[PDB]
Amino acid sequence: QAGVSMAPIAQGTMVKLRPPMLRSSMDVTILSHCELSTELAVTVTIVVTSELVMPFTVGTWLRGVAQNWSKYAWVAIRYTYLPSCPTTTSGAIHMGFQYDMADTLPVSVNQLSNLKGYVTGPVWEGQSGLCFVNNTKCPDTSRAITIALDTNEVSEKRYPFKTATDYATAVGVNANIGNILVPARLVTAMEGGSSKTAVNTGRLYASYTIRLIEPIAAALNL
Amino acid sequence: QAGVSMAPIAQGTMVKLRPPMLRSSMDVTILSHCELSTELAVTVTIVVTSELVMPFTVGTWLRGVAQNWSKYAWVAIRYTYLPSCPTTTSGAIHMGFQYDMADTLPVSVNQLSNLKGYVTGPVWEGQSGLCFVNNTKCPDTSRAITIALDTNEVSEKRYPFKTATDYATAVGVNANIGNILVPARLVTAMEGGSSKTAVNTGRLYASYTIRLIEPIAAALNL
Amino acid sequence: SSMDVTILSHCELSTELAVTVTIVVTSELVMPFTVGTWLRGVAQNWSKYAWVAIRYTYLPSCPTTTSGAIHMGFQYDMADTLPVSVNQLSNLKGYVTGPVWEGQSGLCFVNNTKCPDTSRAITIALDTNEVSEKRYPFKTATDYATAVGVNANIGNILVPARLVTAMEGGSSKTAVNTGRLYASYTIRLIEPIAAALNL
Amino acid sequence: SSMDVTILSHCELSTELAVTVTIVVTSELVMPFTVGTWLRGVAQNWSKYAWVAIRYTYLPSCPTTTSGAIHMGFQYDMADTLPVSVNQLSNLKGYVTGPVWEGQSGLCFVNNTKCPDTSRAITIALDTNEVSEKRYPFKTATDYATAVGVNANIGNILVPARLVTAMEGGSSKTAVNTGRLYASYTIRLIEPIAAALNL
Amino acid sequence: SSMDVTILSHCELSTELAVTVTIVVTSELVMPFTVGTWLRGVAQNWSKYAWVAIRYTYLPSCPTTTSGAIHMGFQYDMADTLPVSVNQLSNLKGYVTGPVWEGQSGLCFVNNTKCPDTSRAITIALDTNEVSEKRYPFKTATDYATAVGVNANIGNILVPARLVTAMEGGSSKTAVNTGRLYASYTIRLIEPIAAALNL
Numbered sequence A, B: 001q002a003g004v005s006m007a008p009i010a011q012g013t014m015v016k017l018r019p020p021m022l023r024s025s026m027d028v029t030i031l032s033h034c035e036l037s038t039e040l041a042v043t044v045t046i047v048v049t050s051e052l053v054m055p056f057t058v059g060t061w062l063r064g065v066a067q068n069w070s071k072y073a074w075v076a077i078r079y080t081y082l083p084s085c086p087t088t089t090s091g092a093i094h095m096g097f098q099y100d101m102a103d104t105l106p107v108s109v110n111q112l113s114n115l116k117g118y119v120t121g122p123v124w125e126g127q128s129g130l131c132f133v134n135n136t137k138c139p140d141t142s143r144a145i146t147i148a149l150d151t152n153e154v155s156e157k158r159y160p161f162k163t164a165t166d167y168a169t170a171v172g173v174n175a176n177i178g179n180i181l182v183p184a185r186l187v188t189a190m191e192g193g194s195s196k197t198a199v200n201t202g203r204l205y206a207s208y209t210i211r212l213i214e215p216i217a218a219a220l221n222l
Numbered sequence C, D, E: 001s002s003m004d005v006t007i008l009s010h011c012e013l014s015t016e017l018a019v020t021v022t023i024v025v026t027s028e029l030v031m032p033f034t035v036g037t038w039l040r041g042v043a044q045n046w047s048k049y050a051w052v053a054i055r056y057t058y059l060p061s062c063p064t065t066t067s068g069a070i071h072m073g074f075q076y077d078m079a080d081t082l083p084v085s086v087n088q089l090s091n092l093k094g095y096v097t098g099p100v101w102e103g104q105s106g107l108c109f110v111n112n113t114k115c116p117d118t119s120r121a122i123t124i125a126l127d128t129n130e131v132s133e134k135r136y137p138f139k140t141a142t143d144y145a146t147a148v149g150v151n152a153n154i155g156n157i158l159v160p161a162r163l164v165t166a167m168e169g170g171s172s173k174t175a176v177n178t179g180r181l182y183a184s185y186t187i188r189l190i191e192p193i194a195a196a197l198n199l
């Protein structure tokens, strides 16, 4: 049994998220969770969207808690994708990382393909990743559509917690004031398409482990 | 050596707060901390102030974190006081608990004295309590000015997290809609005085242990 | 010290204070320019630097009847907002309070003894691990200021942390002097420059 | 080491110099873009990097009869002022100088020869240990430029250091070509990006 | 070592020289104040010190075609006379000399490079062992000056030694800039004082 596939018509995956895990050592607090991040859809043409890997931006929950603390450090951050359409849908996905907040985004798949977590897959694929979201014991991720921060090669040792707006304002002065506020931005591409009008494909989840560190009341944190 | 006191001129106490402690079991999260709650000052005359023992109201930090979760349960809540003036300052302090949000506050010390944590002391006293704030190993609290919830005799098994404003609005409809939103309110009295104009005395700290329970993003919690 | 690096330790009054009827909240950057005057005049002839250790301590100087308190704590992202209240301040990294007349058990830190009793030293020391930058440039108050004025986020690379001191307490609407705050540091002086040329 | 990490070592021409009657002070940013046009074209393909080593050497091209001297020192606060006098410059970090005709004992750093004489060699290597940032991003002059002009303190985020070179000598108030500056580096390249997209 | 004791090492420009037709003899006190303007600004912050090491090196700035020679020797009785002739000067303590164009093999002391050639290098290091006084106080020129003029024997209390430099060479009876003298020291600073108060 080798070199023999069986093309399904649909990949089913049932996500049942696990409760957040929080645990405090003396001054550091460690949080590990996973929330859903974005929903994706394909078009006849390329489409590059992008995301800040900062805690406010990563999760709806995250932001609300992580905000009670002055500066964090990522320990792990994973973007993993999961399909919703049948294996008949046309179009693939691509993601990779970028780091100088002043760099323009790629416009070509060609381009996109040399970034740090370059990963790509037909839009109907992705169910291998499931354990990462569920966080189960992974089977064989050979084929998953995951991307993970290169946590150890970030520029700052720690980063302050920033609110979107504070960020923005800053960035607006000079885009690379930004280069402190965030360690990296994730880049997404949806090409391959069939409809000129968007077809919804999959959705992707974030899974992190962050160090929290110098308590502040939320109201004062920007 | 018995029945012999030595009147100091001032009670010194150095508070050095301990880092918050958070620890998650599966769905419940447990938080234990202590923050400063109020500052007190005396006057020639009685003065009854009062406080809601709900998480938003208890601490500046608390509120910001506790807000990421749907409903909590108190496990412990302590109000402990500490002096700042010399043992020459006139006026004592009193605190006790109240529970039907519709009940009018006491106006007499007499009155005040039959409430659930009735505790009182000259305004210059209080340094016995220190361990509770520092949380050290307590020496002899015989004479401390502390008050603690009667956690096991609260009305609801769990309470939803309420924002001040949401509370208020509710209360405004009918004061005892309130009776769900909060398990009890602390009552403070400052009499004894000397100046007609307020003299600052001590300050009091809150020390809690709360159960957190059915995660919600902050933005949606009211 | 190496032939490249200089290590310097010292003590100094970083600042003097009083208390009033009401609250007053100050803040002082934990930058060698602002920590004391000597550090200033010395550090000044070095381009970069690194805090090996830094600590603020208080020493009472008023009567046992002066009524009041001191509260110190640390902030680390200059975009953040100085606590309004003491309340907010009791939640910062390093919170500490004490009656304005207590604190002389701390004298050993200005001294260098081995405070057996650190139990009642009103002191505060920086979490140098958790600092964001490996090293820091020597900024002058001015330059710093002007810089911030553009977009506070920039202060984040100009400095490790800001100390917040609250002085609530009082009897007079008239400030009454209570104490003094001294600094104890072990700076890591780093790549010479001629004073005059530094900002 | 070669994974996702790329290491490469090279040696090229950073720039050429000439002397006048008076003193002229220049500065070079020490970033991959501005160090040489080669590295520049190679490094653009990666998002951020860190200097494992870099160093400037000067090689004479004159007769023994020219009149001048080169000087150089590193500076690290994109915000401080350039020296304005030999003396000032004299206490920068790699202070090094000599007559515009001396220097040959430097091929070696260029050359990549093991040569037990540094005897004299107008060479200055960076103190690649005491850089502010763990790593630095690839910044393209024009951007740098732009940013630095918002506030001359942002650059501090973007570059580990700046070389100062002063040409003082003077025979003629005309400009005399005296030699060249060569950079010798070992850089560690790291998050590949399409070249075209790197500001 | 860094307690209450501070050690630091630096290297800077002590002074510049030029040659005439005739012989000119100068002298430099070798005290922190007068050694350089950097040390000077750093040392003022401390009450007394002792030289662990100090040394002057000369670096050419001319063409190979200048005409002169520098000479130098240390002297230790603020009361004896300056030499008046090469010969005399010839038997001072670091006697060293060469043509104003030689010397490059000295960057090294400046440079802080290990270089197996002192082959020739117009360098003179102090015999930091045979100083009269255990330590010396920080004296500020104008004071020194003043005192020495009471009796030229008080200075002997205030400074460990004096450098003598003679510029003899002569092409022109006009003054020709030939190079500079650089000091390289390792000083041990000791009883901190407000700068402003140190005479």
Ligand SMILES: [Ca+2]
Pocket: A070, A160, A161, A162, A163, A221, A222, C077, C079, C080
């Ligand atoms: Ca912040």
Ligand SMILES: [Ca+2]
Pocket: B070, B160, B161, B162, B163, B221, B222
């Ligand atoms: Ca609610």
Ligand SMILES: [Ca+2]
Pocket: C047, C137, C138, C139, C140, C198, C199, D077, D079, D080
């Ligand atoms: Ca500077």
Ligand SMILES: [Ca+2]
Pocket: A100, A102, A103, D047, D137, D138, D139, D140, D198, D199
């Ligand atoms: Ca770039």
Ligand SMILES: [Ca+2]
Pocket: E047, E137, E138, E139, E140, E198, E199
């Ligand atoms: Ca003196």
